[PDB]
RNA sequence: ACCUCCGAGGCUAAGACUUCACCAGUCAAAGCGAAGAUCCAAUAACUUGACCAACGGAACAAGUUACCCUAGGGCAAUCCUAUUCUAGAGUCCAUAUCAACAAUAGGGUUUACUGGAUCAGGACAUCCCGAUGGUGCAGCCGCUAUUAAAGGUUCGUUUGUUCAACGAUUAAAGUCCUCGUGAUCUGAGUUCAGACCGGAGUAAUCCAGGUCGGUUUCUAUCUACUUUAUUCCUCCCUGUACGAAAGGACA
RNA sequence: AUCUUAGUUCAACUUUAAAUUUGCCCACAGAACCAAAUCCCCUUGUAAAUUUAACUGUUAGUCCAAAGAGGAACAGCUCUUUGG
């Protein structure tokens, strides 16, 4: 039990976390063709996929918010110049 | 008893709604805020409530206040709180009634 | 400045048992006023008239007015104590009135000694009388007071412990304020109840 | 001198003053 | 009584000594927080149970991502003692519409593609 | 809060407030006109009142049950004591004795506006016996102090909130815990019906009063258990030491 | 509130079915003359909340942290409040 050491070396604290043990296919057929993947692997792919989609969505929203703020600063700081003529 | 504010700043208050129920004059009436015999403050005109700090100039007809202001140094003033209702809707509009 | 067992003008309204006036750091009358030796209270306690009288009688035995004197900082007893004499059970109406008492807080001076005297007569009798008082106390001088206070400051400053009570309390670090009192935020973990632990920085 | 809740006890223990070790021991050097 | 705690802002002020102690930088801060729960909601006031139920932190460690904007920090400053916050790191950029199904989050907080 | 201190018994109409229900209660723009509940009785009426103050109100009902029956429930402000400063005394001197206040310690205070017999287990904070220190005991004995719980710790007159007094003794007649012990036995009670005396009451009846009388049954299922020398007196040793005379030792 | 505190009714809380759209958290602003915090909302994290139809059931609990009132500032003491 070396969770401290494993996290000090960029590994999962729990050897049953992410690693060759948990996600490589536990078996193949005798001939060589691979096996229908295991349920746990499917569920972890789905959850990691959802995590990535959420990451990209939140980052996009924050960047778009920054751009919207830039636009508003432009159209309020410069449209006051239209009142500086005539 | 519940003698306290009942519509706080930035609240939409219609006509007649009580803004504040009080015992003494903690909050004096302001623009569009009327007082009842029991010092309740109610909203005369539909709008949005605000609170402000203003200068106090009591009625000369009153006596317990017209004299205390007479006991104050040069450059003195009694500031006090007021509760106004900035009205929201306009009084009315004009619409076509007859084309003759 | 002689005092009496009970105030000549007792308060008409029966004041409740106000105890928040002893569990804190003394703020008024903490420093000397033209003195050289005194007694510093390391705790917070109620002094009855008997304690005051015994203090006076014990100090009087080493007085020579031409050299040294002592003047009292504490006021006269002015806080009622409710009798509820023997023969009753809990509850059933507030009791009668007993002799009034005076409070003292930690880091407070009860009676200050002035004059150009010797430094060991205090260790002769004021040590005894401090040991007599109903709360933790010590006999202190100007130089010794300065030494103790500056060393307290140094200890609070040259502390190699990364965490102190300040940081863990103010920031509500480990959900800690669920098991503390608001006064802790300002007492700084040095006045648990009516006491005063000085070795804590 | 009443007892403290246990968590307050742990907090008092962890935050206890630790003094700075002197560079040299005075006995064997001024 | 026992009451909500208003943390003075003075604590949330990184110093020149803190900056080189954790892998951060005053300028160019970090987009997303990865947050995990490392303590029970039980035995804590309801105004922390609700916050945790709102940040999606109901389950145990189970990391979850949130924006690094003050509207969420105000919530994390109430539950800062029941969570670990680390900054998400993207040393390969946001994934494309390809590589969404082949990502992975390492214990150091870096999101990467194809393990 | 029977905690802390005091008094009272014009009409119409948007919108709202409220005594944490309801019932009641409260404010009010504009507009039109003038400047403590319900039920009951008397009532043409316009409406009207007392009680409901136990003030959400039975229309009108008190004292009491010792002959009662049923359903049920059941870390002490003020203080006691020992150790700390000696400070006060003691024919001189705090330490040979009390040792005042206070402080530090262990322990309780319920009423007003449960013993005895039988057998006893245990602690020591020791009454005796044992060992030791100082003494102002110059000596047995006294005084205090340390140590010691193997053993022992009487019989009677009067009486029973349980003690106290008194007689005779004894080496001593210890302080407490387990009424310790009522499926081992007994008595008083305090609270069983009878009766009398004194107090309170119109009476029934009451009385944290005083007298006389008065019934708690058990075949042992289970545990546990049923064969673990002290003191005193007398006499030698004698009246040495000790002792200021006088008295009078150990082994 | 109750000839009522060994119970009942109303409320609060709970449940089901149904309708609708905002509910909670929340910075800045704001709430008096005579310490902890509280109230109120734009955003934000969320997915809940209000309303309607229909019933029963619980109700004056114990301990701990804290602030008070009563009994010392104690008697493991009666009571109110925030939290667990
Ligand atoms: Mg109401
Ligand atoms: Mg009008
Ligand atoms: Mg009634
Ligand atoms: Mg009533
Ligand atoms: Mg808002
Ligand atoms: Zn050395």
CA–CA dist D20, C155 (Å, integer): 9
| Element of type H or E holding C140 | strand C137-141
d(C-alpha E43, C-alpha E49), whole Å: 10
Nearest residue on chain C to E81, alpha-carbon basis? C174
Give which of C149, C71, C74 is closest to C104, Cα–Cα.
C74
Instruction: Tell me the CA–C1' distance in angstroms for B37 and F40.
Output: 39
- E34-63 residues near strand G (Cβ < 7 Å): 42-47, 50-51, 53-56
- In whole angstroms, what is the distance from residue C32 CA to residue B3 CA? 49
List of chain E residues whose C-beta atoms are within 8 Å of the C-beta of residue A41 = none
E113 Cβ contact list (under 8 Å, min separation 6): E92, E95, E99, E102, E103, E104
| E65, E69, E106: residue with CB nearest A54 | E65
Contacts of E7 in chain C (CB under 8 A): 170-172
Residue B21 · residue B2 · CB < 8 Å: yes
Nearest to E24 by CA among E108, E87, E85: E87
Chain G positions with any atom < 7 A from a protein CB: 24-27, 29-33, 35-46, 64-75, 77-78, 81-84
Within 8 A by CB and 6+ apart from E106, the residues are A10, A18, E112
Residue C103: φ, ψ to 5°: -90, 155
The Å distance, Cα C152 to ligand 6 centre, comes to 28
Phi-psi region of C56 (alpha: psi -120 to 50; beta: other; left: phi over 0): alpha
β-pairing, B28-29 vs B79-87, is parallel
Do chains C and B touch, with touching meaning 3 or more CB–CB pairs less than 8 Å apart?
no
Of A68, A51, A57, the closest CA to residue E31 belongs to A57
Query: What is the Cα–Cα distance from E69 to D15, expressed in whole angstroms?
Result: 33
Q: Under 8 Å CB-to-CB from E61, ≥6 apart: which residues?
A: E36, E37, E38
DSSP single-letter state for residue C126: I
And the tokens for E43? 């035995």
C-alpha of D1 from chain center = 20
Would you state the torsion angle of the CA atoms of residues C56, C58, C64, C66, taken in this order, to the nearest 10 degrees? -30
Biggest CA-to-CA distance, chain D = 45
Question: Which tokens belong to C49?
Answer: 């008239």
The structure's method of determination equals cryo-EM
Two structure tokens written together for E98: 């390809």
The answer to whether C20 CB sits below 7 Å from nucleic acid chain G is yes
Residue A64 sits at the chain E interface (C-beta within 8 Å) = no
Contact C177, C187 (CB under 8 A): no
Domain boundaries, chain B: 1-100
The token duo for A30 is 């005798």
Residue E108 sits at the chain C interface (C-beta within 8 Å): no
Query: Residue C46: what are its φ and ψ, rounded to 5°?
Result: -90, 125
Taking an 8 Å cut-off on Cβ atoms, the answer to whether C161 and D18 are in contact is yes
Q: How far is the CA of D28 from the centre of ligand 6 (A)?
A: 4
DSSP reduced 3-state for B33: strand
Name the helix (H) or strand (E) containing C99: strand C97-104
The domain limits of chain A are: 1-86
């Amino acid at each position: 039990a070396g969770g401290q050491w494993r996290l000090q070396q960029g590994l999962a604290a729990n050897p049953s976390g992410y690693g060759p043990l948990t996600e490589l296919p536990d078996w193949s057929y005798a001939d060589g063709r691979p096996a229908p993947p295991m349920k746990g692997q499917l569920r972890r792919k789905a959850e990691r996929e959802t995590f990535a989609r959420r990451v990209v969505l939140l980052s996009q929203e924050m960047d778009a918010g920054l751009q919207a703020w830039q636009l508003r600063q432009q159209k309020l700081q410069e449209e006051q110049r239209k009142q500086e003529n005539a | 008893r519940r003698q306290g504010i009942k519509k706080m700043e930035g609240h939409y208050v219609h006509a007649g709604n009580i803004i504040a129920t009080q015992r003494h004059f903690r909050w004096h009436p302001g623009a569009h805020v009327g007082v009842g015999k029991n010092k309740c403050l109610y909203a005369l005109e539909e709008g949005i409530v605000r609170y402000t700090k203003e200068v106090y100039v009591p009625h000369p007809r009153n006596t317990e206040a017209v004299d205390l202001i007479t006991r104050l140094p040069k450059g003195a003033v009694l500031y006090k709180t007021f509760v106004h209702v900035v009205p929201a809707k306009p009084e009315g509009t004009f619409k076509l009634v007859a084309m003759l | 400045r002689f005092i009496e067992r009970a105030p000549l003008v007792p308060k008409v309204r029966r004041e409740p048992k106000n105890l928040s006036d002893i569990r804190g750091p003394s703020t008024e009358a903490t420093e000397f006023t033209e003195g050289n030796f005194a007694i510093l209270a390391l705790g917070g306690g109620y002094l009855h008239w008997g304690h005051f009288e015994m203090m006076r009688l014990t100090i009087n035995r080493s007085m020579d007015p031409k050299n040294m004197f002592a003047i009292w900082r504490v006021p006269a007893p002015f806080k009622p104590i409710t009798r509820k004499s023997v023969g009753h059970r809990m509850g059933g109406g507030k009791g009668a009135i007993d002799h009034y008492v005076t409070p003292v807080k930690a880091g407070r001076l009860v009676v200050e000694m002035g004059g150009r005297c010797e430094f060991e007569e205090v260790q002769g009798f004021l040590d005894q009388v401090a040991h007599k008082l109903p709360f933790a106390a010590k006999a202190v001088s100007r130089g010794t007071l300065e030494k103790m206070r500056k060393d307290q400051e140094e200890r609070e400053r040259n502390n190699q412990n990364p965490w102190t009570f300040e940081r863990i309390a103010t920031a509500n670090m480990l959900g800690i304020r669920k098991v503390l009192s608001p006064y802790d935020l300002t007492h700084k973990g040095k006045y648990w109840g009516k006491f005063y632990m000085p070795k804590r920085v | 001198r009443r007892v403290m809740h246990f968590q307050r006890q742990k907090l008092m223990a962890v935050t206890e003053y630790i003094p700075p070790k002197p560079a040299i021991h005075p006995s064997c050097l001024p | 009584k026992f009451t909500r705690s208003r943390i003075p802002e003075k604590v949330f002020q990184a110093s020149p000594e803190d900056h080189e102690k954790y892998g951060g930088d005053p300028q160019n801060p970090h987009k997303l927080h990865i947050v995990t729960r490392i303590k029970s909601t039980r035995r804590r006031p309801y105004w922390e149970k609700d916050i945790i139920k709102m940040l999606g932190l109901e389950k145990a460690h189970t990391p979850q991502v949130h924006k690094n904007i003050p509207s969420v920090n105000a919530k994390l400053k109430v539950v800062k003692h029941l969570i670990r916050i680390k900054p998400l790191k993207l040393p390969q950029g946001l994934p494309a519409e390809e590589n969404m199904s082949n990502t992975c989050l390492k214990s150091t907080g870096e999101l990467v593609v194809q393990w």
